[PDB]
Amino acid sequence: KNRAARVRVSKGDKPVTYEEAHAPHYIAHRKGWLSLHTGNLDGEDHAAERTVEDVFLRKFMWGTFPGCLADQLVLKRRGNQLEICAVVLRQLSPHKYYFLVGYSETLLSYFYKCPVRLHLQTVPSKVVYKYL
């Protein structure tokens, strides 16, 4: 049987998100892409460096906002800019969010040598697409 990126059915008590409920054969039919850049286009270059930056960002943000991320990130590149769009929870205090936004935006700008901006969208609870 196939296993990649599939959430196995259960009794019915397990909540899943939209992206987590669709398998790889829906990535261009019912889902989009979590990262958007030009590396993988025909005739373009530096697709390998853009991938290592993505892998590091998803981990930097998972450990920098522990227990706060409601769903996967959405990385966007428009020229020199790098826009990180995240959906976070409302448990943490806003004072601590503004601290981490300025700490991460700055640390990542000096690391990758690019202007970085972070966009948060708070939700009360993790959105549920269905129950498996």
Binding site: G79, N80, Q81, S109, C114, P115
Partner: protein, 131 residues
């Protein structure tokens, strides 16, 4: 006022710290998205449009005749013989190379000049007079 002040003299600490107080009166937080882009562009973080792939890269102000015409550096070599033919091929490829600078192309040539000065005794057995 005075026609010519002491422009050569550099501002003192009192003048450098007073100019930082005049840049704070007009200091205000970013009011819109456009202003952020403007601030970044002035600092140098954001690219200047329209896009130029050669931005910030001038190869030491070198003209095309410094990359393609390298037989000016072959004046310390035999004018005729195998060394000339060989060194006429090195400079032909060095002329077709857009990945090197003129400062790097001369290094290659100077290395051969010094290399043939150490092999003089070996070039005499083959009847080759290098300097």
């Amino acid at each position: 006022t005075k026609e010519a002040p002491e422009t050569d003299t550099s501002p003192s600490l009192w003048d450098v710290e007073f100019a930082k107080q005049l840049a704070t009166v007009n200091e205000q937080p970013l009011q819109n998205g456009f202003e952020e882009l403007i601030q970044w562009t002035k600092e140098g973080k954001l690219w200047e449009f329209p896009i130029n792939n050669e931005a910030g890269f001038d190869d030491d102000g070198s003209e095309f005749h410094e990359h393609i015409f390298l037989e000016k550096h072959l004046e310390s070599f035999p004018k005729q013989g195998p060394i000339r033919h060989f060194m006429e091929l090195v400079t032909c490829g060095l002329s077709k190379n857009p990945y090197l600078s003129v400062k790097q192309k001369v290094e290659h040539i100077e290395w051969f000049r010094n290399y043939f000065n150490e092999k003089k005794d070996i070039l005499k057995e083959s009847n080759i007079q290098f300097n």
